[PDB]
Amino acid sequence: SAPDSITTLVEDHDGVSVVSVSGEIDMVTAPALEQAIGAVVADSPPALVIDLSAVEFLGSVGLKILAATYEKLGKETGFGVVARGPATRRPIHLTGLDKTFPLYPTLDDALTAVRD
Numbered sequence: 343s344a345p346d347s348i349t350t351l352v353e354d355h356d357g358v359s360v361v362s363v364s365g366e367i368d369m370v371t372a373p374a375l376e377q378a379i380g381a382v383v384a385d386s387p388p389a390l391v392i393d394l395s396a397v398e399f400l401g402s403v404g405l406k407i408l409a410a411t412y413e414k415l416g417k418e419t420g421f422g423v424v425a426r427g428p429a430t431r432r433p434i435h436l437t438g439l440d441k442t443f444p445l446y447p448t449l450d451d452a453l454t455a456v457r458d
Contacts, residue, residue: 359387364396367404389420420456
């Protein structure tokens with residue numbers, strides 16, 4: 343991963359939109375991530391998973407983006423976040439966001455839950 347660099351991949355998995363992010367989420371890269379997620383949310387998917395498995399640094403603005411995303415989804419829209427390791431899981435846990443929406447250790451786990 344390069345400094346101030348982000349990759350966002352958006353892919354349909356059998357009706358579930360998966361937004362997969364790599365690199366670092368902070369004030370510099372946040373507008374790119376926000377625009378990507380915003381366009382997915384605007385398409386009203388039946389479910390949305392944000393996969394942060396490949397994110398090496400998750401800053402505060404990234405948490406704000408997760409919470410704002412959840413707050414604007416359809417009332418019946420499935421949602422989950424995938425996070426592995428302390429760089430991503432610790433900020434989510436410290437701020438209580440995993441009490442607001444489901445946090446999963448793998449994409450497979452998230453996809454199973456959103457389809458049940």
